[model samples]
Target: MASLAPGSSRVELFKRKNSTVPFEESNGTIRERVVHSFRIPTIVNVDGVMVAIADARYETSFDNSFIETAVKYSVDDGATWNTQIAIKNSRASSVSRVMDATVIVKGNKLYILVGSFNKTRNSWTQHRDGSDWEPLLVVGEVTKSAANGKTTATISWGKPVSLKPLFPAEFDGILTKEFIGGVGAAIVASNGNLVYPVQIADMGGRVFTKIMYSEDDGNTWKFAEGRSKFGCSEPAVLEWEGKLIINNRVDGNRRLVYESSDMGKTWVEALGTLSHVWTNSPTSNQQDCQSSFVAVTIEGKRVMLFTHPLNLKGRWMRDRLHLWMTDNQRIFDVGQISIGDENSGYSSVLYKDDKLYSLHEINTNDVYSLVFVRLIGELQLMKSVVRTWKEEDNHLASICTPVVPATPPSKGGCGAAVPTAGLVGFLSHSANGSVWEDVYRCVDANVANAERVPNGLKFNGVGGGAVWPVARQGQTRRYQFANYRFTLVATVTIDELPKGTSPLLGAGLEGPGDAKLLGLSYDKNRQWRPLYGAAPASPTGSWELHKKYHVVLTMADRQGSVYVDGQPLAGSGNTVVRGATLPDISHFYIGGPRSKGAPTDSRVTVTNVVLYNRRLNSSEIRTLFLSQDMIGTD
Candidate 1:
């Protein structure tokens, strides 16, 4: 065996010792090879030894044929794993298949709880339509042996015993043969009672939560009365202050949540209490799957981590799994992480001695392979840093600023060039601080058009057209404008205005009903109209083409006006309107309203465009126009 390398970085290693593979037969015919797949893993830590158990099912025609329990042990914090150990069934013939096995440590023994069914009995029902199975318990005595100054575990198992009789007599006549228990780990209650989450279906094929508790260790088990709501199964529970919180798998888009205040004796639906309401598992549009939940303390904070496929679309694509952490057990968005973009199936997570381990099914070339994931703390530290900088945040300007050396004072320039700052949530250019790239998405521009110019973008619509900024998910242009007072200043040179309404710059709400648009538009009547909510103000002004123009639009306190050459136009006034409520703006256009699909025949060149979060005062707007020589007619 090769020596394992030691490192502090986050490293992923694959163990192919237990993978299932297909085979070929003689005469060039592919034989129906029975490949054994490991799935729905359950793990526990006993005396620093990590024991992982899964149902090793043979991929054959019969789904419940030739199934057994498989075990693997890790002594070096999961860095290395031992060979697979197959446990033989004491009742060799009666037990056709063993399923849903889990390992739990009680006293000094390891208890393996599993369910088995017989193939001879065709009485087994389908879809939880009154099905029955026998509960089997395998006890193992773990001892330590010393050899060559090293100690290793020596495990020996006893005969498997039937746990069916321990169940209550009420389920005897209804579904005597169908008894399923302990798909997940068993928790020791605060009063020394061993608690296991079990479930059984009624005659109508609906499954519910059932609690099996043992007061005197594993000597005997008793079932708790009262089940949860319908369509809930494979429950994972956590004990908090003598109360139990159960999160179960259901055939719906949201996980079925239940709470038990009386130690699982009675369950009440608690979906409204969860901080994060999402689909608990990956399933087809109608089917259901399993998920995992564990409690761990990271960085001195106690948190419950739930792992499930975030398949909100319910397309049955089990390709992504998400880990959500909640310290208060209600809000799960405090910390979120994605495992990977692979074909991930049912998973089980456990945290032991500062190390987090996850075992699940991953697809390897269309073959299922059970892989282990180790949550290295340092690797997550780096991930959290990037997650903190989402596009919805305004802090992107501070952390993601371009590292350009300060330019030396220009010897031949009037007034040292003001330090150019980047506009938040928009395009950036490194060549010139004042020059910005395409902040708008070109609509009418051709394939090789809308190229970057000196201070802004140049669009040739040939008539009168427009271009708008591309809308980003969770970061729309309207959100940026609505959150602050508005100010837009630009310097432009237009060749000529066509015989149509040519809007220079504007934005408005998009669809349905009236959309309040605000900007400056040049009408065919040769009048420059300052618009507010798709209509001009009480009065408007006129402007001529063939000359460079400096324009400004400011809106504050429910009043709006336009300024040409740093002077407010005529008929501009402030009205005592309600709190400023602009239309639900949809587009931010440069040449015209692209949402209207207007054509363009006039040629326009923009030297600079700047947007501010706050309305600029008259003096401030005058300084900006005078400071730049491009505003004057050239």
Candidate 2:
């Protein structure tokens, strides 16, 4: 999405427009003058000189010379920017600059954590000065200035403490393999937890985000454990109402979003009116890094601030920062201020007292500079600017929506079905919850799969490691996909279980292949142990059934069995779940356990999936599978 602003920037208006030009001698010699106007390149913010949006210690890359980036800041809500900082760097063929740099302000000190890559490349013919690559930490001080009526900032990197490289070559220290590493978002939570997100790309080039933190400023780092959730990177951490809340951007897939209520330790996808309507911001087209910039801005009230390039793929090479403010962290509307270029990104922000400042660069070749803009009169000035863009906002509004957050199933009822926007819905098994994302692509045929399946997903990994179609609870925590009721169908389609071992049946130490369909009831009369038996031993022969089927996991008359495509498979009686005394779950796990690596065995591959809000009838199940040219459709 390009900026809705149809007018060209002062810079854009003057840059190489006419290749074959002539002095028309008729009208003042067809003057070739740079348009410098108060309106065109209007001095949005002329407060100060220093542009310090992000000042800290983070790794920056030098892969494509097009990647040498820095942070730029405008103190007066993006009025004028001039200063920048160098927090992350990589050696060029000769000039080394930082990459993927993110910063945060804690008290008077700013911390920058970045991911580094190898500096050396394939040896050239005669040039011999390519040094080996290594990661480093650069800390600095952010000083402010008041030029004219606006305040500019300057960032001086303290004697930077260069850290021993994270990946010299491989884990063994040989520079043979290129280890894909980088950092996205960083924040010092109001609760003092230093949450930093680190990411590594898969061999396929897609990346995943994870958490590493330190409680004592920059001391030691520890990785989080349990429940695998990696759809977003560059999370924004804040302490709202005592609990630590981290808001983040989902990766790869764009139709969903993620939030963590328990710091970075655990996370669940949101659902219902409480869920969010994520936007692919106009700034998205230019933001190269994950969670590029997320800040909390305060004018009279508090608004969550987010920055990105103005388009989807960020195909536009310039570093143009688009600003957006959100009153509710869940909903994002366009806001005032849009600035940046190839050199500026990952802004570090601060609003101390009434002053707002950020640090970033204006061009890739320049060192980090600082710039500030005053919002007192400028916000109003920008309001008119926003209005002008709105007329041309076909690009921006294409990604935004009129809000009235809808619950699941009713997603588009409020006219809020933002195309290509990723959304997460939740279903609680116990106090613990499982997040189901909307991977709306059909396994084979897109149509006739009914609405998005309750749990249809392209699940990877062991058991149900894919998507889950959300369903409401019935009674006694007994969840029937639907009422066996409702106008909507409630069902799930389980695809290929990873390759290890076979699917399970009776009890054992380990559950059946990913879907160890369990059912138990606590007997206070006896010790709360495995009521059914141990978990059933999964049989050897491949349990084949309808292609797109329905799995009914429940305890009706104190018995349990997997209903394949609405028919029972190896029915077992009196099978009881152990932990149902306090708050037991009659219906548990989708394809597998609640957490990653829970069952130990890893091989599993699931394809097209579907989940309904109500139980599917025999005819409905058959129709679904057959419609995709499978037998069920017949």
Candidate 3:
């Protein structure tokens, strides 16, 4: 994970107490503000202005504290923010303590919904069970006036009432209560319903995030039928393709992305790339935290954006915040938005007018601050990643019968003709003596310590290999988008076994910590060392010298799998990589580690190398294996 330095251009939207409010440290000196917390922000757009809100935890820096739902906004974009307004629990309800807030804005009306906690100073040692917690709704009017080209939005809030009706009589048998200590917002569904999500505390303590919808706008609401997958809560939801999609928080490492087609009447895990990537991936953070999601349409392409804690640390240590882009099927890691080693969790996002804004939290010395961050140069990063994804999709469509790259200079230098669509050939010595030419098309290749035998290309032992970008004949495809779904096959013959270990090939990831996200090496003990990410590779089996074997690396849906001779690598049958983000590749290294150095020795001749921009299934893998048609050889 990149500890990006985009901690630039930010404004602290809410600070409970400035450093001036000092408290004594037990051993003695007076301390600046006794570390109070401000967190759980939710934001919305009202007439071209951004209205961001947060939890003002004035007393303690924990989840259970007297909180004022706070708001700070900007009129002329997010250049400067207006004064802060404590809006939570502002109306005349008897509920005293409030923390989580979800705002919904439609046309000219704003509905602010909040959850509560039972707090009492009568006994500091009292155990707070939150049994009396009730949901509250504060309705408001949003009206805008423009004069002299200067626009101002006026918010008129009404009395807050207890939303005790959210849990209907039909649900009382299973739905017990709710303790929403995090952040989320309401989404206007494509079917004209207002949906807001919450983690419902069921009768059996089964906890999962669910939604409450308002069919008649703000008149009344009803809870949905099913909760999300077990052990997931603190949801961040968005409308995807007319269905309600949620990216919720889990206590585990990765995210649990679920979707509901029948308006929460039923929900199942969506076959999505997001459920895999997140913190569990070697390229992302470690623990799962409350993050925000949004779908934006820019230049007529709809892409989904979400905020994640990019810190590569253990649970609860959220340090970095990054924005990731996805097209619902695959992910494209964009870059970082902000970083803080403290409790920088619970962020919300909004994208408009080619710019994106986020209201996030940062805990410093036990005191927390809600900061508003705007993407200045990061917007271009999003656009570039999206364009590359589109281009890759377009390229695949050309080869695919619906199966989907280029008119590379040519495709017939090899002995016979093969499918040229989505295939890039390298290191076919039978076709090029100097290794100066690609077997299928023209491409960039740097070769050394290799000779062309009558059979194929021979890579000498130790300090011998070749390097090439994973691009087309004249295109920088690797630099643009990492090959997410593709198959890389190399029909290699081990001339001699290495004494210790030897790297066969590797793909340099564009976005990881220079770690070869997909790398494989062999040892003299007939072991195939498979490497995915920087993590130690698992041991698979038994390749020998003087035998022809087709070693393959395949990546599809962000998962990386390797195969040998059309069969899975000895032990873990094919599915090697799991729950990881495949970073865009930079270069493809053959017979070595990088162009600078090969870590170990390899007496190998690698020929019949084929690269595809699309993934090959098991059937295709075996078919390609038999198609090579050997010359009286096994």
Q: Pick the candidate with the highest lDDT.
A: 3
Q: What tens-digit string does per-residue lDDT give for candidate 1 at 530-627?
A: 66654444436666676767777766555666777778766444531244443344545555424334444445555555554456775556655665
Ranking by lDDT: 3, 1, 2
Q: How would you encode candidate 2's per-residue C-alpha lDDT over 44-82 as one tens digit per residue?
A: 111232233222211222232322224444454444443
Which candidate ranks first by TM-score, i.e. highest? 3
Model 1: runs farther than 4 Å from truth?
1-35, 59-63, 83-95, 120-132, 145-149, 171-177, 280-284, 311-317, 329-340, 364-366, 377-379, 382-634
Stronger candidate by TM-score (1 vs 2): 1
**Residue 418 displacement in candidate 3 (angstroms):** 15
**Could you estimate the TM-score for every candidate?**
0.54, 0.41, 0.64
What TM-score would candidate 3 get against the native? 0.64
| Model 3, runs deviating above 4 Å | 1-8, 19-36, 84-95, 120-130, 168-175, 179-182, 203-206, 280-287, 311-317, 339-343, 396-634
Question: Of the candidates numbered 1 and 3, which has the greater TM-score value?
Answer: 3
